Write a protein that binds this ligand. Structure first.
Ligand SMILES: CCCCCCCCCCCCCCCCCC(=O)OC[C@H](COP(=O)(O)OCCN)OC(=O)CCCCCCCCCCCCCCCCC
Ligand SMILES: CC(C)CCC[C@@H](C)[C@H]1CC[C@H]2[C@@H]3CC=C4C[C@@H](OC(=O)CCC(=O)O)CC[C@]4(C)[C@H]3CC[C@]12C
Ligand SMILES: CC(C)CCC[C@@H](C)[C@H]1CC[C@H]2[C@@H]3CC=C4C[C@@H](OC(=O)CCC(=O)O)CC[C@]4(C)[C@H]3CC[C@]12C
Ligand SMILES: CCCCCCCCCCCCCCCC
Length: 145
């Protein structure tokens, strides 16, 4: 029970400036119209991962392609909305953000390499990049405790 040896610090992410940007976005990030509106985008994104099936009409496969993009942008827009509102160094210190950073930087590059302008050759395969967009399911584990 004597963990008073640690756990001294608290939040300490206050910008405390009423600043032009930093205390304009930080107010947006906190005070849920964002905490529940990103807990709803990781709720529909765990439904477009279950909606893949075998022999889809090729316009079902296309609706999922443009939905996956429409969640990657939202999750990437989240990513550059917390480097701004918290600062770069205070962002990469929760370990639940450098997880959400990796999944988005790994799913941004899944959209590109499976698109044109770059070829899938040189004996290296983009099949393992599907794990990065199927790892957004673990973002639901965060609201366990
Ligand atoms: C939970 C952990 C899951 C780990 C990944 C399991 C992958 C299972 C599998 O069958 O992957 C196959 C695939 C490569 O083979 P594929 O492209 O599917 O077919 C080639 C046919 N000659 O596999 C790949 O392309 C990559 C497999 C994962 C690589 C990273 C592992 C860490
Ligand atoms: C968290 C959950 C409760 C929300 C929604 C998830 C499931 C209820 C949905 C998502 C994807 C669906 C699947 C998507 C595709 C198919 C193929 C489909 O096969 C056909 O094309 C034949 C008949 C048909 O068109 O449904 C049969 C239903 C099934 C398995 C669906 C069953 C219901 C699933 C699992
Ligand atoms: C974004 C989240 C909430 C996913 C839930 C959306 C689904 C309710 C939508 C998205 C893609 C839709 C599908 C896209 C393509 C088709 C093929 C379509 O078959 C056709 O050939 C008709 C017209 C066409 O798409 O060319 C019939 C409807 C269906 C199954 C749609 C049914 C409704 C779906 C599953
Ligand atoms: C034949 C296509 C059926 C698609 C069913 C999608 C259900 C989505 C629930 C949310």
């Amino acid at each position: 029970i004597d963990f008073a040896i640690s756990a001294k610090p608290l939040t300490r992410y206050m910008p405390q400036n009423r600043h032009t940007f930093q205390y304009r976005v930080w107010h947006f990030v906190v005070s849920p119209s964002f905490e529940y509106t990103i807990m709803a985008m990781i709720a529909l994104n765990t439904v477009v991962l279950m909606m893949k099936y075998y022999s889809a009409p090729c316009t079902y496969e296309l609706a999922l392609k443009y939905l996956n993009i429409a969640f990657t942008m939202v999750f990437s827009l989240e990513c550059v909305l917390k480097v701004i509102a918290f600062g770069f160094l205070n962002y990469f210190r929760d370990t639940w953000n450098i997880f959400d950073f990796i999944t988005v930087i790994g799913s941004i590059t899944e959209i590109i390499l499976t698109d044109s302008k770059l070829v899938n050759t040189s004996g290296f395969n983009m099949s393992f990049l599907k794990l990065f967009r199927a790892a957004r399911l673990i973002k639901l584990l965060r609201q366990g405790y």
